[PDB]
């Protein structure tokens, strides 16, 4: 994932959403239950980020 001109590569066990999509300009109004494309609520177990 590109963010702010850096690459947020993360080989990680994400519970991926059924309707995934990204945004150019995403905004969430403090709503912590919204996920763009993955809705893990715990730290997901992985090897590199």
């Amino acid at each position: 994932e590109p963010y702010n001109g850096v690459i947020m590569a993360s080989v990680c066990q994400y519970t991926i959403c059924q309707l995934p999509y990204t945004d150019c300009k995403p905004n969430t109004n403090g709503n912590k239950l919204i996920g763009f494309w993955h809705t893990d609520v715990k730290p997901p177990i992985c090897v590199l980020k």
């Binding site: 059924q18 309707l19 969430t28 109004n29 709503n31 239950l33 919204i34 809705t39």
Partner: protein
Amino acid sequence: EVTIEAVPPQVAEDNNVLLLVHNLPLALGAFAWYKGNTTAIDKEIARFVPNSNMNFTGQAYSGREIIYSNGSLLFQMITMKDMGVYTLDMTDENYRRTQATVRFHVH
């Protein structure tokens, strides 16, 4: 618990019915209305959330169905195809229950 009523349960052609939700809870993640007795998203009609106050439509939105804050669904023109069952999905804390079903008839 949650109860759903059709007012009126029998509607004439091209009139108004109100899918009146009763005793809905408060801290819901979101909710949406589902055509038929299924939960596949292509029969989801309109999806409105309580905590960000935006509504969005599904594939089967015919365009004349108003979704309200109390969960109620208002129809504008009752068509003959819209006879059948309707299921109201609710989600909370990334966990769901689909236990709000309703069926009416048109004459």
